[PDB]
Amino acid sequence: EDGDTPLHIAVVQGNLPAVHRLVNLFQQGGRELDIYNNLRQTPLHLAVITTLPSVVRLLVTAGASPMALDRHGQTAAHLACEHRSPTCLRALLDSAAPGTLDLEARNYDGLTALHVAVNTECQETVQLLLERGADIDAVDIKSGRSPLIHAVENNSLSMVQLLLQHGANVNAQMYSGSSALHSASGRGLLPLVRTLVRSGADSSLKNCHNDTPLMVARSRRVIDILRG
């Protein structure tokens, strides 16, 4: 009945023994493990939110779906990344049966788990996602930007270097035709300009305004990096 969630409560209380007991009780009763509270969270969602990798493992092995969406369309992988929890992300990926967990899932905003991870500045979740097959060039509908472009706009030299190291397309363009280099160049982000150029960014690429990164260059310093 409504308003009582013994399983959700057992999870938030970090009581694995009680979760175990309840999982068995729900199963024997034929009940769904992926039942929602009023916040549209499943017990598995809450296991990730509470950072309980052992409970994550238990629920997933018991049949809880890593693709169940929360109120914002987040999968369990999205939530692990939101909560900067490499251990929960690992528990999910390792415990999920093959063919059940898709890392290309887009939440309601349109982002993949990789986009979320890049935005949190957590190198650990980003690396694990890529190691497990996340599309490094995935483009969300809202922004039209790859994770690389997101990192550049966040002015995160660490995420930029990490993505490039894992084979990110340095010449991905947004809807307007601007690349990561246009962004770094127009905003005077020197360290990022250096890295992108050295990594092979195309400085002759024209956007919708017919501008190259050189043409939007903010300062004589950026300009000089771009000329070589």
Chain center to CA of 116: 3
- What residue ranges define each of the domains in the chain, with the CATH number in brackets? 1-228 (1.25.40.20)
Question: How far apart, in Å, do the first and last CA atoms of the chain sit?
Answer: 69
- Residues 155 and 145: their CA atoms lie apart, in Å, by 15
Tokens of 89: 């992300």
**What are the CB-based long-range contacts (under 8 Å, 24+) for 199-206?**
199/164, 199/170, 200/170, 201/170, 201/171, 202/170, 202/171, 205/171, 205/173, 205/177, 205/179, 205/181, 206/177
Sign, CA torsion 138/166/123/101: positive
Question: Resolution reached, in Å?
Answer: 1.9
